[PDB]
Design a protein around this ligand. Structure first.
Ligand SMILES: *[C@@H]1O[C@H](CO)[C@@H](O)[C@H](O)[C@H]1NC(C)=O
Length: 130
């Protein structure tokens, strides 16, 4: 479902929608061993041959890297090369892992371009359930 989020630095892209499922109301919650489906609609303001995603869980203000199944944006629903003013749908999953403490965690998701600049950066709170 479309979720409310905080933009943490979208620089060469413009976010149109952050859709995380299951998340009808917030904070999203999901148990360890299950994965969220993520679909980010954004419009690029630059051309780029490549794109790379990176996710962090900010736990009590401390960032921790959060692995995803595929980090190449061009293999995540985006047909590269990325073009200026074109709209894309970045799609991936976020597994909730046993290593994550079962408390509120802020998830930060980013996608960068050839120049390592942020197409998008957004944050949302999630509750990790054991
Ligand atoms: C991603 O969201 C768009 C709506 O912006 C929809 O057309 C598309 O099917 C969704 N993609 C998948 C793979 O979830």
């Amino acid at each position: 479902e479309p979720v409310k989020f905080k933009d943490c630095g979208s620089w060469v892209g413009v976010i149109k929608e952050v859709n995380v499922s299951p998340c009808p109301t917030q904070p999203c919650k999901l148990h360890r061993g299950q994965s969220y489906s993520v679909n980010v609609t954004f419009t690029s303001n630059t051309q780029s041959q490549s794109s790379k995603a990176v996710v962090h869980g900010i736990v009590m203000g401390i960032p921790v890297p959060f692995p995803i199944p595929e980090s190449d944006g061009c293999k995540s629903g985006i047909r590269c090369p990325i073009e200026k003013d074109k709209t894309y749908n970045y799609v991936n999953k976020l597994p909730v892992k046993n290593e994550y403490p079962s408390i509120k965690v802020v998830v930060e998701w980013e996608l960068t371009d050839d120049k390592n600049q942020r197409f998008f950066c957004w944050q949302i709170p999630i509750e990790v359930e054991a």
